[PDB]
Amino acid sequence: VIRMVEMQKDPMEPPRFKINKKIPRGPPSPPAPVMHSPSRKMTVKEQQE
Amino acid sequence: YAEPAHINDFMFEQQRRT
Amino acid sequence: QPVKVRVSYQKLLKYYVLNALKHRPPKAQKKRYLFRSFKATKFFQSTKL
Amino acid sequence: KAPTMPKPQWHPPWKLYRVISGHLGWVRCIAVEPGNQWFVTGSADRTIKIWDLASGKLKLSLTGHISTVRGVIVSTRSPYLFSCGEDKQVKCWDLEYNKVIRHYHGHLSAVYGLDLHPTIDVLVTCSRDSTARIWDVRTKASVHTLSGHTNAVATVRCQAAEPQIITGSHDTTIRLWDLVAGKTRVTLTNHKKSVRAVVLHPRHYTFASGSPDNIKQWKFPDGSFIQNLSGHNAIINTLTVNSDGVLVSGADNGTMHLWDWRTGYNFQRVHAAVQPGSLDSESGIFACAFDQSESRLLTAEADKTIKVYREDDTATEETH
RNA sequence: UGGUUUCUCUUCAGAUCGCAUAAAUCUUUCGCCUUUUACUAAAGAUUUCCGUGGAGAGGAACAACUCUG
RNA sequence: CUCCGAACGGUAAGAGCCUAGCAUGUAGA
């Protein structure tokens, strides 16, 4: 058991560090598939239409 | 694995130090 | 008839009207106790001198 | 042979009662006041002008945008006629003094549409740079960047029933980004074309959706494809649905096909005319929304003529 | 029925809440203008700050002096 | 008749040598 006691900082101060250049999350995603419709050719006259 | 408890901090710190 | 008293009475009556002509709001507010939060901190301390 | 074929819904055909043409350019947005008195409608002349909802006469003219006004969302919970311009500025023109009051910014390109949430005090500004924006009303600051689209987020929907915010992406994939988190909770396995239309029928069912090619219905809890749309292959841009069961589809080709939200068959499927000063193939319904009294339909065409379609009683319109 | 004070925190303020009155921002106007900020003040509405008003919650001082009824 | 202005738009450009008022408060054996 460890008690989580938040330290009350001084409410008048410059920030302790600069702008954080650390990566917050992961650039991979959950790439969900489309599964909308089977893509196929229209017709032989589709190139002329 | 974190597992918090709703026990009092006063009685817990007094019993462990005794 | 001073020449200094005429424009000084005109300008003092100018800001008397202008602070009451358009500067009449109902003056709503929501927040309070600005410096009272610093007195309740763990670092400041009140005294008398 | 078809299921639920001999029992369709009832839908009498409509008729145009007045064609107001006062704007200078293609009208891109149209909205009605909740008091059924004002009718806010933008144009390509960078001037959001309000007109009478019933009389049709002009009521006001409010300019200020630097590009085409492609969004006008009149807030019903607060007196503020917020507008989305294409000059990367969501000019929240409050109607309390007929001027800009907020002038919020943050988008990197043009804004496609804006929708005011009925419960949360925030405005969902569907931009077109790379994502939408959850702008906080009366705070002049963004809440979270709901980046869940691979293209421009055209449509937007802020429903109180749906916990997420239904965003319509032009990358052929609709998404439902949550308000608290921001990530898309569920995608859409439909709408193979660039989806730039969305609707909602909260009268007796869940909120539907739409698409230009091969449109289909949906559901509010996590999505559920009920049925597809009829034979409307044109580029649909306006999709309105009334509480009486009418489903109006406004396409860019001018074929304003009106169908039923329950039956699905096209009741009227009529095509509108054009202005004499306009070209031959220029009439297209870019925005359409029903009135606050749900009596006279209002569709803003691309031929610089805000047309109003009233109702008419008839009985010789039985569908097979 | 029964408590004069004082300090903390929770709302709405449409009462000259302020018997007095600052700054910034937004939309329109004038004067200079030579790049710009510092500029001049007329109109309107949005914040911040100097402050305040009733009504529940927790401590200290005689709460007991017995206040109105 | 007594209404009083401030900054930017400004000193360059470089070679070799020389000296300075500054800052952090660690885990480890």
Swiss-Prot record, chain A:
Phosphoserine PTM positions: S29, S37, S39
Lineage: superkingdom: Eukaryota
Residue segments, region Disordered: 14-38
Protein location: Nucleus
Cross-link (Glycyl lysine isopeptide (Lys-Gly) (interchain with G-Cter in SUMO2)): K45
Subunit structure: Identified in the spliceosome C complex. Associates with U4/U6-U5 tri-small nuclear ribonucleoproteins (U4/U6-U5 tri-snRNPs). Component of the minor spliceosome, which splices U12-type introns. Interacts with SKI, SMAD2,SMAD3, RBPJ, RB1, PABPN1, MAGEA1, SIRT1, FOXN3, U2AF2, DAXX and ATP1B4. Interacts with PPIL1. Interacts with VDR and RXRA; preferentially associates with VDR:RXRA heterodimers. Interacts with NCOR2. Interacts with MAML1. Interacts with NOTCH1 NICD; the interaction involves multimerized NOTCH1 NICD.
Functional description taken from the UniProt entry: Involved in pre-mRNA splicing as component of the spliceosome. As a component of the minor spliceosome, involved in the splicing of U12-type introns in pre-mRNAs. Required for the specific splicing of CDKN1A pre-mRNA; the function probably involves the recruitment of U2AF2 to the mRNA. May recruit PPIL1 to the spliceosome. May be involved in cyclin-D1/CCND1 mRNA stability through the SNARP complex which associates with both the 3'end of the CCND1 gene and its mRNA. Involved in transcriptional regulation. (Microbial infection) Is recruited by HIV-1 Tat to Tat:P-TEFb:TAR RNA complexes and is involved in Tat transcription by recruitment of MYC, MEN1 and TRRAP to the HIV promoter.
Gene label: SNW1
From Swiss-Prot, chain B:
Cell location: Nucleus; Nucleus speckle
Protein name: Pre-mRNA-processing factor 17
Species of the source: Homo sapiens (Human)
Function: Required for pre-mRNA splicing as component of the activated spliceosome. Plays an important role in embryonic brain development; this function does not require proline isomerization.
PTM notes: The reaction is catalyzed by PPIL1.
Disease field: Pontocerebellar hypoplasia 15: A form of pontocerebellar hypoplasia, a disorder characterized by structural defects of the pons and cerebellum, evident upon brain imaging. PCH15 is a severe autosomal recessive form characterized by progressive microcephaly, and poor or absent psychomotor development with severely impaired intellectual development apparent from birth. Other features may include spastic quadriplegia, early-onset seizures, and chronic anemia and thrombocytopenia.
Entry superkingdom: Eukaryota
Oligomeric and partner information: Component of the pre-catalytic and catalytic spliceosome complexes. Component of the postcatalytic spliceosome P complex. Interacts with PPIL1; this interaction leads to CDC40 isomerization.
Coiled coil (residue ranges): none
From Swiss-Prot, chain C:
Location(s), subcellular: Nucleus; Nucleus speckle
Tissue expression remark: Widely expressed.
Known partners and oligomeric status: Part of the U5 snRNP complex. Component of the U4/U6-U5 tri-snRNP complex composed of the U4, U6 and U5 snRNAs and at least PRPF3, PRPF4, PRPF6, PRPF8, PRPF31, SNRNP200, TXNL4A, SNRNP40, DDX23, CD2BP2, PPIH, SNU13, EFTUD2, SART1 and USP39. Component of the U5.U4atac/U6atac snRNP complexes in U12-dependent spliceosomes. Within the minor spliceosome, which acts on U12-type introns, interacts with PPIL2 and RBM48. Core component of U2-type precatalytic, catalytic and postcatalytic spliceosomal complexes. Found in a mRNA splicing-dependent exon junction complex (EJC) with SRRM1.
Known role: Plays a role in pre-mRNA splicing as core component of precatalytic, catalytic and postcatalytic spliceosomal complexes, both of the predominant U2-type spliceosome and the minor U12-type spliceosome. Functions as a scaffold that mediates the ordered assembly of spliceosomal proteins and snRNAs. Required for the assembly of the U4/U6-U5 tri-snRNP complex, a building block of the spliceosome. Functions as a scaffold that positions spliceosomal U2, U5 and U6 snRNAs at splice sites on pre-mRNA substrates, so that splicing can occur. Interacts with both the 5' and the 3' splice site.
Name this polypeptide is given: Pre-mRNA-processing-splicing factor 8
Swiss-Prot record, chain D:
WD repeat placement: 22-61, 64-103, 106-145, 148-187, 190-230, 231-269, 280-319
This protein's UniProt keywords: Acetylation, mRNA processing, mRNA splicing, Nucleus, Phosphoprotein, Repeat, Spliceosome, WD repeat
Gene Ontology cellular-component annotations: catalytic step 2 spliceosome; fibrillar center; nuclear membrane; nuclear speck; nucleoplasm; nucleus; Prp19 complex; spliceosomal complex
Subcellular location(s) of the protein: Nucleus; Nucleus speckle
Domain of life the protein comes from: Eukaryota
Residues with PTM Phosphoserine: S21, S211
BP GO terms, sorted: mRNA splicing, via spliceosome; positive regulation of G1/S transition of mitotic cell cycle; protein localization to nucleus
Membership in a protein family: Belongs to the WD repeat PRL1/PRL2 family.
Subunit structure: Identified in the spliceosome C complex. Component of the PRP19-CDC5L splicing complex composed of a core complex comprising a homotetramer of PRPF19, CDC5L, PLRG1 and BCAS2, and at least three less stably associated proteins CTNNBL1, CWC15 and HSPA8. Interacts (via its WD40 repeat domain) directly with CDC5L (via its C-terminal); the interaction is required for mRNA splicing but not for spliceosome assembly. Component of the minor spliceosome, which splices U12-type introns. Within this complex, interacts with CRIPT. Also interacts directly in the complex with BCAS2 and PRPF19.
Name the record gives this protein: Pleiotropic regulator 1
The organism of origin for this protein: Homo sapiens
Classification lineage: Eukaryota, Metazoa, Chordata, Craniata, Vertebrata
